[PDB]
Design an enzyme around this catalytic site. Structure first.
Site, PDB file in Angstrom:
ATOM      1  N   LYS A 148       0.848  -1.191   0.105  1.00 13.57           N
ATOM      2  CA  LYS A 148       0.120   0.112  -0.002  1.00 13.57           C
ATOM      3  C   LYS A 148       0.758   1.257  -0.101  1.00 13.57           C
ATOM      4  CE  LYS A 148      -2.983  -2.921   2.816  1.00 13.57           C
ATOM      5  NZ  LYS A 148      -3.487  -3.030   4.232  1.00 13.57           N
ATOM      6  N   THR A 149       1.802   1.548   0.741  1.00 10.50           N
ATOM      7  CA  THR A 149       2.720   2.544   1.091  1.00 10.50           C
ATOM      8  C   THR A 149       3.319   3.080  -0.290  1.00 10.50           C
ATOM      9  OG1 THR A 149       3.216   1.410   3.288  1.00 10.50           O
ATOM     10  CG2 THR A 149       4.526   3.583   2.561  1.00 10.50           C
ATOM     11  N   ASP A 168       1.561   7.091   7.595  1.00 16.54           N
ATOM     12  CA  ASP A 168       2.036   5.937   6.986  1.00 16.54           C
ATOM     13  C   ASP A 168       1.107   4.590   7.573  1.00 16.54           C
ATOM     14  OD1 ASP A 168       3.490   3.743   6.122  1.00 16.54           O
ATOM     15  OD2 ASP A 168       5.399   4.094   7.204  1.00 16.54           O
TER      16      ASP A 168
HETATM   17  N1  LIG Z   1       2.699  -2.168  -8.599  1.00 14.90           N
HETATM   18  C1  LIG Z   1       3.333  -2.341  -7.181  1.00 14.90           C
HETATM   19  N2  LIG Z   1       2.382  -2.661  -6.155  1.00 14.90           N
HETATM   20  C2  LIG Z   1       2.930  -2.967  -4.765  1.00 14.90           C
HETATM   21  N3  LIG Z   1       4.314  -2.985  -4.571  1.00 14.90           N
HETATM   22  C3  LIG Z   1       5.122  -2.741  -5.552  1.00 14.90           C
HETATM   23  C4  LIG Z   1       4.729  -2.509  -7.000  1.00 14.90           C
HETATM   24  N4  LIG Z   1       5.612  -2.204  -7.769  1.00 14.90           N
HETATM   25  C5  LIG Z   1       6.765  -2.639  -6.810  1.00 14.90           C
HETATM   26  N5  LIG Z   1       6.407  -2.730  -5.495  1.00 14.90           N
HETATM   27  C6  LIG Z   1       7.359  -3.127  -4.478  1.00 14.90           C
HETATM   28  O1  LIG Z   1       6.552  -3.686  -3.330  1.00 14.90           O
HETATM   29  C7  LIG Z   1       7.131  -3.231  -2.254  1.00 14.90           C
HETATM   30  C8  LIG Z   1       5.893  -2.352  -1.526  1.00 14.90           C
HETATM   31  O2  LIG Z   1       6.315  -2.461  -0.040  1.00 14.90           O
HETATM   32  P1  LIG Z   1       5.128  -1.596   0.886  1.00 14.90           P
HETATM   33  O3  LIG Z   1       6.020  -0.785   1.799  1.00 14.90           O
HETATM   34  O4  LIG Z   1       4.164  -0.641  -0.007  1.00 14.90           O
HETATM   35  O5  LIG Z   1       4.322  -2.876   1.650  1.00 14.90           O
HETATM   36  P2  LIG Z   1       3.097  -3.038   2.378  1.00 14.90           P
HETATM   37  O6  LIG Z   1       2.315  -4.246   2.025  1.00 14.90           O
HETATM   38  O7  LIG Z   1       2.040  -1.477   2.174  1.00 14.90           O
HETATM   39  O8  LIG Z   1       3.738  -2.761   4.041  1.00 14.90           O
HETATM   40  P3  LIG Z   1       3.251  -2.584   5.382  1.00 14.90           P
HETATM   41  O9  LIG Z   1       1.603  -2.905   5.304  1.00 14.90           O
HETATM   42  O10 LIG Z   1       3.905  -3.764   6.177  1.00 14.90           O
HETATM   43  O11 LIG Z   1       3.542  -1.049   5.865  1.00 14.90           O
HETATM   44  C9  LIG Z   1       8.171  -2.218  -2.433  1.00 14.90           C
HETATM   45  O12 LIG Z   1       9.421  -3.118  -2.717  1.00 14.90           O
HETATM   46  C10 LIG Z   1       7.912  -1.717  -3.924  1.00 14.90           C
HETATM   47  O13 LIG Z   1       9.078  -1.479  -4.505  1.00 14.90           O
END
Ligand SMILES: Nc1ncnc2c1ncn2[C@@H]1O[C@H](COP(=O)(O)OP(=O)(O)OP(=O)(O)O)[C@@H](O)[C@H]1O
Ligand SMILES: Nc1ncnc2c1ncn2[C@@H]1O[C@H](COP(=O)(O)OP(=O)(O)OP(=O)(O)O)[C@@H](O)[C@H]1O
Ligand SMILES: Nc1ncnc2c1ncn2[C@@H]1O[C@H](COP(=O)(O)OP(=O)(O)O)[C@@H](O)[C@H]1O
Lengths: 529, 107
Positions: free
Chosen positions: A338-339, A392
């Site tokens: 998501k972030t 965040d």
């Molecule tokens: N289209 C995409 N969608 C999601 N992530 C992507 C995409 N393209 C690349 N990424 C990579 O995926 C990872 C995303 O990490 P992110 O911090 O958004 O995870 P998260 O699931 O939101 O984390 P959390 O809930 O633990 O904070 C990063 O490495 C980003 O570079």
């Protein structure tokens, strides 16, 4: 008709006329009529604004024009001691010259001006906030007794400067005391142009500056810079140009002609602007690389939907009246990534002020520090025409654990109150959240505060996984064919981050057993919502 | 003459527009003294700060011949939350004591 525009002041031209109309109307007319009326003069003024918008110069110029003696500068935090009844002596010592002149010359002495600074330091209102800063309230009272009381002084003028206009004691703003307020906000395009012009007068006279450089380009490029940042940029450019010239001269024994010439050129300006100066009220391009580590790859339709909806919201908030505040929330399962999407949509807005507040910089802080930091960030964001703040992880901020449950109520209340407070008139704002547990969040009754919601799904089809792998490009042709053959069951439910971690794990052996290991690992994580 | 103190409570579903109506009815009175005690101006305060602010505002109101005090979003002042439940007892006790205290004679 004044002439100060070009000597020291520069950008701020209207504030002078405003303050002169409001305050010093009495001292510009012939003394005969004023003495006939019998009116008194204002006994001080107050200034507030951002840290470094050019406040001291105003006081110095105002003191100079009135034909007064040397101002007695002083600092706020300096006047404070742990001994009983020692601050009062420091406060009293300031007026001694004024009292002596009043005693000797009677009612014909000149004007003495005392310039405090960070006057908010000495006040009992700060004790109201969470903490113990009573600062022996008595102190402030003493100050009043010098401005007004049994003894009358008529040859003084007090100018105060502050950075937190909400922490000033109410008793220090009544008639007969400091009774004129004014604000000093950020400069504009013309102000930036004038400031750069005035700070660059020295080199032009000596032809040292190169003719290649323009001033309009630099003026427009700097969006939300403040006063100190412009002179810092000038100094950094000078330093880097000198370093480049000396290094080039050392490398090559060029003829003297170019050796004497020290043209700063234009490349130094661009390099220093893009590398050295980091505005406090402007976009920070560096932080973006710390979150979007691997870019964005289009593996399905929903990403386009989310991006389009974000663009629609940005457009709606940009140009619209009757609605200066907008909110949005993102939901999805853990590891959905998501972030990154939130950061991308925030970046694409091209707004001048973008900030990210995450628990990343907030380990070990007590709840009170958390509320203070949140309030500071939002207050700073309030001081721009357009702003974009990112929160965040809402769940981590609240300190939520299913056992119990347990959490901190103060932070929740502060956040809820902040989310429903419009900025001052004529300014916009945008807030974007993010969480991984909507059920509890709705149970907490905050989902009603947000205005819209979006859903971020995971990968759920084999062909989607094949396309993602192809875009990443880490498996060969026969490997891809075997993977497609083995994954045709269509029972796939994984997150992007987990997929990347698993690919990295699988690629840690010899090429022969990569496919089998990867398939075994993928099947082991056989989730079924 | 025999009813120097009066109270009235407005309630309804969320987003119904209560604060605006309260402000309008307060304004229409034409009284010499009017005051509003909103929670958004006490961000991050502690219960003691809130009680002190309420006491100060009511003391200031006591000194007139006619006055009107508006308190907005009562449920938010108490720091209520359905889970728990939780709230600050001190603020509730203070407000209960206020809501049945008469001013000095002839006001
Ligand atoms: N289209 C995409 N969608 C999601 N992530 C992507 C995409 N393209 C690349 N990424 C990579 O995926 C990872 C995303 O990490 P992110 O911090 O958004 O995870 P998260 O699931 O939101 O984390 P959390 O809930 O633990 O904070 C990063 O490495 C980003 O570079
Ligand atoms: N006749 C009306 N009744 C109610 N609101 C009206 C009316 N006419 C216009 N409005 C607008 O409705 C909005 C009322 O906002 P208000 O803060 O009072 O709402 P609320 O639902 O009581 O808020 P809160 O979230 O604090 O419970 C204002 O924009 C006001 O201009
Ligand atoms: N309007 C302005 N025109 C020219 N220079 C300015 C202006 N505002 C600030 N400055 C620069 O800022 C510096 C002074 O900063 P100052 O306002 O004293 O900071 P602070 O308010 O924190 O003391 C000076 O060197 C001056 O060149």
């Amino acid at each position: 008709d004044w002439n100060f525009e070009k000597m020291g002041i520069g950008g701020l031209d209207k504030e002078f006329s405003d303050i002169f109309r409001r305050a010093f109307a009495s001292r510009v007319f012939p003394p005969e009529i004023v003495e006939q009326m019998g009116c008194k003069h204002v006994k001080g003024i107050l200034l507030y604004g951002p840290p470094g918008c050019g406040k001291t110069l105003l006081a110095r110029q105002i003191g100079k024009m009135l034909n007064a003696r040397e101002p007695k500068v002083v600092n706020g935090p300096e006047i404070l001691n742990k001994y009983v009844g020692e601050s009062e002596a420091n406060i009293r010592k300031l007026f001694a010259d004024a009292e002596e002149e009043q005693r000797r010359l009677g009612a014909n002495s000149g004007l003495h001006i005392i310039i405090f600074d960070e006057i908010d330091a000495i006040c009992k209102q700060r004790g109201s906030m969470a903490g113990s800063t009573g600062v022996h309230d008595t102190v402030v009272n003493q100050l009043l007794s010098k401005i007004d009381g049994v003894e009358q002084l008529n040859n003084i003028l007090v100018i105060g400067m502050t950075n937190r206009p909400d922490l000033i004691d109410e008793a220090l703003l009544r008639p007969g005391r400091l009774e004129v307020k004014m604000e000093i906000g950020l400069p504009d395009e013309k102000g930036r142009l004038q400031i750069l012009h005035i700070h660059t007068a020295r080199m032009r006279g000596h032809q040292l500056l190169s003719a290649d450089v323009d001033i309009k380009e630099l003026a427009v490029e700097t969006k939300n810079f403040s006063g100190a940042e412009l002179e810092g940029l000038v100094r950094a450019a000078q330093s880097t140009a000198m370093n480049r010239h000396i290094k080039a001269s050392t490398k090559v024994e060029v003829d003297m002609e170019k050796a004497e010439s020290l043209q700063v050129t234009r490349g130094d300006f661009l390099a220093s602007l893009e590398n050295d100066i980091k505005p406090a009220f402007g976009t920070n391009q560096e932080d973006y690389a710390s979150y979007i580590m691997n870019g964005i790859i289009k593996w399905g339709d929903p990403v386009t939907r989310v991006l389009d909806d974000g663009e629609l919201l940005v457009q709606q908030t940009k140009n619209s009246d009757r609605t200066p505040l907008v909110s949005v929330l993102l939901e999805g399962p853990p590891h959905s990534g998501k972030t990154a999407l939130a950061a991308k949509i925030a970046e694409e807005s091209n707004f001048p002020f973008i900030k990210i507040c995450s628990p990343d910089k907030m380990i070990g802080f007590s709840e009170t520090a958390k509320c203070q930091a949140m309030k500071k960030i939002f207050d700073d964001a309030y001081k721009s025409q357009l702003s974009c703040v990112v929160v965040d992880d809402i769940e981590r901020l609240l300190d939520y654990v299913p056992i119990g449950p347990r959490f901190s109520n103060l932070v929740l209340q502060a956040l809820l109150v902040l989310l429903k407070k419009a900025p001052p008139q004529g300014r916009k704002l945008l807030i974007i959240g993010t969480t991984s547990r909507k059920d509890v969040l709705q149970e907490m009754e905050m989902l009603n505060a947000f205005s819209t919601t979006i859903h971020v799904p995971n990968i759920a089809t084999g062909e989607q996984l094949l396309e993602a792998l192809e875009l990443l490009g880490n498996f060969k042709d026969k490997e891809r064919t075997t993977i497609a053959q083995q994954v045709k069951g269509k029972k796939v439910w994984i997150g992007i981050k987990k997929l990347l971690m698993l690919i990295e794990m699988s690629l840690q052996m010899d090429p022969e057993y990569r496919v089998r290991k990867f398939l075994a690992l993928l099947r082991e994580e056989g989730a079924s919502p």
